[PDB]
Amino acid sequence: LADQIFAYYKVMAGSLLLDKRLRSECKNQGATIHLPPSNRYETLLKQRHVQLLGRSIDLNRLITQRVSAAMYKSLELAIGRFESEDLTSIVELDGLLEINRMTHKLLSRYLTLDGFDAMFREANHNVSAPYGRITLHVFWELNYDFLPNYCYNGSTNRFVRTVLPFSQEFQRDKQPNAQPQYLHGSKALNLAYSSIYGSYRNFVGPPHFQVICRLLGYQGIAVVMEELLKVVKSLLQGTILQYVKTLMEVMPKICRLPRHEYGSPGILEFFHHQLKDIVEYAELKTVCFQNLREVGNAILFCLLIEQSLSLEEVCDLLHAAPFQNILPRVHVKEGERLDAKMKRLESKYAPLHLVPLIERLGTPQQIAIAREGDLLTKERLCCGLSMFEVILTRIRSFLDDPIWRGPLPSNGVMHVDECVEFHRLWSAMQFVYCIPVGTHEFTVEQCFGDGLHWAGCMIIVLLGQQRRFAVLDFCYHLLKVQKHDGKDEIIKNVPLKKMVERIRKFQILNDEIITILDKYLKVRCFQPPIHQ
């Protein structure tokens, strides 16, 4: 009796939450989903006088015990199933959790059960620990798979998988398998939900971020942010620092931007000879680019998650306006003044306001709890509070090796010809990956996307070298000369035209990133000559 009752209610909840347009379309095609026939377990559940052999048996208690065990099993299975898949299963977990919550509500109509929040925390190991299993898996997925296997696209604000993966060591846990009832009710319902959520598997976007914010609350966000900062610290202070140190030793000691007289074709030949060590280097496009993509993607994740948190936060506050005496600007026409209309409107909604209603009548404990709850609800993190600035400051602190900035300039003002600064190397990197690749090889965008550019721009900005980078850039200088003269010719099997448009496109992207970073980030006096 308990098994069939649980199955019948679970399928009822799943069918009830299922979309109707899809059901109608499937029926028209010829793949209709049969509804679950109704039953009459109402009388059985309420029975409490089962007299047998001169004994009184409480059938409700036994059914409650079985249903409670089944609900715990389903919640554990849902979490385990999420733990055995990638980060795109978040939508599926939320949908399955909603089904379980609704089933609990339906069963609570006739039975008594522990609150869904308590059971969810029990299955997530969060009641006795600050952090649950979901947040741990999200952090694990971010470190292993998501960061080094996704390329960002700022135009669509979406993440998509890359090609030629550089890591295959995730080795996720085996998927849990159980009866159809524990997961999305009947087998027919299971196929429909899987198809519905299959569209979210090929990308990660705002819908994933908002669900993460809802599930992780605030503790999950803070711990994730701190761990990401530690990951960035390890990468920058470790492998990245070694690569830049090695690369700086193979860069020209003195580089001077040619004069316009040489012309765009001749200026490309100068740069290929000057930077021929960097071009021949192979690990640049395999390791250093990978590491830069990791940090760049992390910063993007921090930015996007903050935006989603604010969006959810403002939506939540909108629903609390009636109970906080937060009224809109009502229409006022000729004949009446604003003060009278506002006072009347406030009086109309006076009963909704909570604090004075409890104050006039209610236990002091209720008054204190209501006051604390009101204070927590009204004060939130979208009312003049942000954290992206703090993340940028911490990243700047992680950069302390002198190699990033280099020795003091001999002229007493700034380095012009010397190449002892990081922005110089980034310009060399820009040159190498702006060369048109062959048909049998992939491009930087196809592999790393915009994460690499974000990381480089952030490093430049935090070191206060953005202006120097714009002024001193081999690619920008070549583009300017090409525009001035307008000549095309193949130099070392590198077309000159297609190169400059690529330079222009990356110049636009770099400028946009620098502007965004500067916006989020918000002297020296020389002496005059003295007569001998």
Add this chain to the structure above:
Amino acid sequence: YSIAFPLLCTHFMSCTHELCPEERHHIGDRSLSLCNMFLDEMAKQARNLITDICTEQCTLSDQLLPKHCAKTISQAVNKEKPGVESMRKNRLVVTNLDKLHTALSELCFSINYVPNMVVWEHTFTPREYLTSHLEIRFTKSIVGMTMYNQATQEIAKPSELLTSVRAYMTVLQSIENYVQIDITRVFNNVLLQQTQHLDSHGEPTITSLYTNWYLETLLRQVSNGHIAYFPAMKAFVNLPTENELTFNAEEYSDISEMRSLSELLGPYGMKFLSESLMWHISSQVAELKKLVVENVDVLTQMRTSFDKPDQMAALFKRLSSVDSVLKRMTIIGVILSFRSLAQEALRDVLSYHIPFLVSSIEDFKDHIPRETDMKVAMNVYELSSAAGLPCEIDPAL
């Protein structure tokens, strides 16, 4: 570099000479006009790009709806996709989204270049121009995507509207990454204004259109018999008929749709809808009272003869309007059932939004002493009803 032109207007006062004082006012007035026009045009261009970007985002989100997977389900039973548009084979190919994104970023940088400027001792704040334009455009678009045509009685489903609103909000937040303006306030003003039955300018709001459509299209047809209430599906389903209505009841009265409607409207909108439903009920009750009084003598005689069946046989035959009372009570029950669904949806939505307030209300209502007067109890029920709780007595009725 479009901010240079308003900056140039500041120099218009340098050509004035103390000898010709008459010319100063006319040149000074011309400077104020040009500056305002340039800022307005820049804001107009910005919001135009916002609409195009949001339109593309809404189109992309539309492809994720469950209704597009019917073919896959049918194929599996019997025996292009998202994410490909974000793949960049090369940067030489330029789409509409990136082109608009580049233009918007360039325009935003120009707007944010100068925090404030002074022309003829007048301080100008360009970002306020963009903020005001965004508020107007956002409100106009929201009222426009409801797609309400009175002639054909057609309205958009709440779920689709909620998705479009979320896409618009996400885009506006992305704009915040460029400019220093605060967007959370913009959301508060626009959404709160639409929540009430009339905005500041005195125009129809989202709540008013939905209330009118529900009353004049769904409940009216239920009375006519074309639709019925399905407690098993907790929604209204069109009955098998020779001619079917253009719209489908199950696509508006479902739990998901009601939750979306509550999210868009909020407690105020449901309260306004609740008041309208009670007003209709009062009209029906008043009409019934006329039929009750016109047979008062018979009913009084019938009350005291519950144990005499022979009298009841003839007393019933003398009654009038026996079917009308049942029909009207059926309409009242249908209306009350609709409110219960709305109340349940609001409670579920508010449970995971403001748990602290809901918990305090639940404790306040549950533990209220029974010996208290009716006035305080009515106040508690009204607050409880606003929270979506299932009060035994409806204060609105």
